[PDB]
Point group: C5
Chain length 233, copies 5
């Protein structure tokens, strides 16, 4: 009867420590622990942008009670709801985002994930408001492993290319938050459902079983991944 | 009657605030011993078809006009008004460790019309249709009075003293108006219907018998974060 | 001609028939005219600008050349709720200016003036109607708006430097008389909206009228009564 | 096809009729008015300007203002010195010898100007009583020229202007002898080449 | 069919520049979604440029020789019948109707595409089973050159505007100009119909390649 309506579940990072014996040296922390939680939003009829802001606020509210106090970093959040088309300013030769910033235009609500994380909309109605549905329907869980081909490309170090030409990716933000650039030095550890749906394998990736359909809310103004998503105009 | 005035509501507010009829009041007399007297009134708004924001403005202006007539001349402070209609989701920027609103100000975004109350106060919508315009209805319908004791778990958290960030709450606004911080110095005496509905006990709080649905003279306290003019949707 | 209204306005201000003469004995004459607006399908707020322009066009044609002042216009259509900002103890508009928010189209009148909507459809567009079809004809005169006197504004420059000199403002910036009366709280201006809402509910203008839903246009930007009415939204 | 026909042009004055063509599309009233003025000016820049006609004798303009708004009954002029820049209804402004013809056009029905009936031709002689009052030189005499020395076409008596407008003759002309007897008012920078001329300024948008 | 990309089109652009120039057809695919005409035009231009950044650019083709641009402006608005140039010096920045701008050797094909309906460009006759719009079909739709009495031959960043002989018109042709100003019974108007409908601004100084204006 009188239960909660705007709700979803997700798997986030809870702990980030060293091996049981290791002690801080002169990395950061190697052992990572993840756990499922149920996130509850305040009731009401919200738009997609307002729902996305509240969903991100629930993820960060979890990070502030169990995690920040257990060693996890802001660069390890691992679940974010966005609206951008990453890799928009992508260059085929340098394989980096040349403008140095992801295009700040709203295209379609999105799910950005880090390794070991995911979301589950089996008992939720927010997937429909976000226009992300199951193509053929029991169970709706989108994990990091299901988003093959949807890796977010790394941004160019524009401060560096303008020191001469040195093309290199940007490894940290203004406040020294890791952008999670990988060994290939072209891609980022973040994966997004929108990139895997449009740029992944059309008959084997996330598109084969999903369907695209029709300030406290900006705690990381410097981080290009955690920035507040743009609103549709 | 065709002259019923239509836009009206009843509420209980503070009338007096007089130190006990006694002997002395040194510079070390606890003003928690101040005797507080309350009374019921019927408030009438001008006739017209107003939006929810304009209705909230006129409902708040009716509360203040009563304070200017009776309470102001009987020792009641502007920090003891006791009935305010808002649209914000207080405790948005709340931190589970410090237990304070870290931005120092409540998030100035409109979510849903809200009723904020101080101890001894309340509103009554038994003979009024303004609650339907405010999207606050009875779940199981004879009588609709929402009092301070009915908003358990909806206490508004205290704001962080950002000019001194130490980790203490702000206890006065810029014009030296008491924010009504309590013992433990994390929460405030103000309770809100929206908080008790969403963050209170689901089966014992205000949510069990009220329902959330869809529906400068107006800024006399620009300095005070509690009595500030509500944001517009 | 579709849009047209009738109104009684002042036509002459002259002595009965030395700087010792008191101009409270000036002979004042009023006359009925029919004011016609350009044709079209206008909004209420655009209609109000045209109806006031018709009043001024008559003042420039006869009244101005016959000794009447801009303080004696006597018919103005507004949208404000005057006496918002009224204080129950000082009985003045403490902000020193009337609230510039549109509430409902209003009729403001001076002694001896009035408006007649017997052969006019503008009263329906302005949301002002007769409550019963007992007698044909629709005329609202200054004598019917008892209890709808517009309170006077506070002399803020005297109240602010006193620190208390709580006295009404008796003239505007360009030295236009606000027509303040004895007791120095109220004004000779009356409004239908104030008498409708704040007058006697069973004997005032409410008993036979009904409220329903709805720079040449700013020739007196300094005068708080003749200022261009605010637009909705 | 969105088209219409109109008549357009130191001492002698020539006049000639033409057919003006608009680019195809479904446009609003403001964009339609801008295209029709550009079609008039485009005709002046080819046949006319090179033949001794001045920018003070264009003769056809589509506006939205209510000229004579700031009119004073004593001076018989527009005291603000500028016409009120508010949109009231799309209008047709004409000079002597000019006119517009909507006999094959559907653009008048979009501008809310229809015949109560045929054929629909509106000439300067049909707008009797719709003369635009002259502005006031603010320094009691009418302003005779614009900032760039463009004649406002002031007439004798120094109160009225040679420009006539359909809206003024419809609302302030004779109700049973003017343009109102057979027309009806209904509901609906390349486009600003004369910023100084109060008559030729880009019409305001609703 | 179910997983087929919906927002796609085919076009012929420049691939090699070494002068003899070579062109080839490609199929451009847009991200899925229901986008407006304004937002779709930005994605179609990004697909053309993304192809230039891959095939081309490495082979000597210039940003002057891009050759497929989707616009919304009415070029030749500020055109003068005597000087035959755009006297304001810039094309009018008002949105009229989505448009196709082409250079010699280029073209677009909407035979297997639903984007022509969203761009308000339809076939006037179901007689035709294909819908290809080439540079040779836009006769009379040359975009006039800008003034400064001489035409502007390069952009602000030294990009050739591709001004031609006679120094009045440009090598760029547009469907909207050929539709409204070309031969009514011989140009593109005879078999097409006009109907109702930063990474997106990589050439801010180029008047031809500037981001198209948005309606209203
Ligand atoms: Zn009755």
């Amino acid at each position: 009867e009188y239960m909660f309506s705007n709700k979803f579940k997700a798997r986030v990072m809870v702990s980030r420590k060293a091996p049981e014996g290791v002690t801080v040296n002169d990395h950061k922390e190697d052992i990572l622990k993840y756990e499922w939680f149920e996130f509850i939003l305040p009731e009401g009829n919200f738009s997609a942008t307002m729902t996305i802001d509240l969903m991100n606020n629930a993820i960060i509210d979890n990070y502030l009670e169990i995690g920040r106090q257990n060693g996890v970093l802001e660069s390890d959040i691992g679940v974010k709801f966005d609206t951008r088309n990453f890799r928009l300013g992508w260059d085929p030769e340098t394989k980096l985002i040349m403008p140095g910033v992801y295009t700040y235009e709203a295209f379609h609500p999105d799910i950005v994930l880090l390794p070991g994380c995911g979301v589950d909309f089996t008992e939720s109605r927010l997937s429909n408001l976000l226009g992300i549905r199951k193509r053929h329907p029991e169970g709706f869980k989108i994990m990091y492993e299901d988003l093959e081909g949807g890796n977010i490309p790394a941004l160019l170090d524009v401060t560096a290319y303008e020191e001469s030409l040195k093309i290199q990716p940007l490894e940290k933000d203004s406040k020294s938050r890791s952008y999670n650039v990988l060994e290939d030095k072209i891609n980022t550890a973040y994966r997004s459902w929108y990139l895997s749906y449009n740029y992944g394998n059309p008959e084997k990736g996330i598109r084969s079983w999903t369907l695209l359909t029709t300030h406290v809310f900006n705690r990381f103004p410097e981080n290009q991944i955690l920035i507040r998503p743009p609103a549709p105009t």
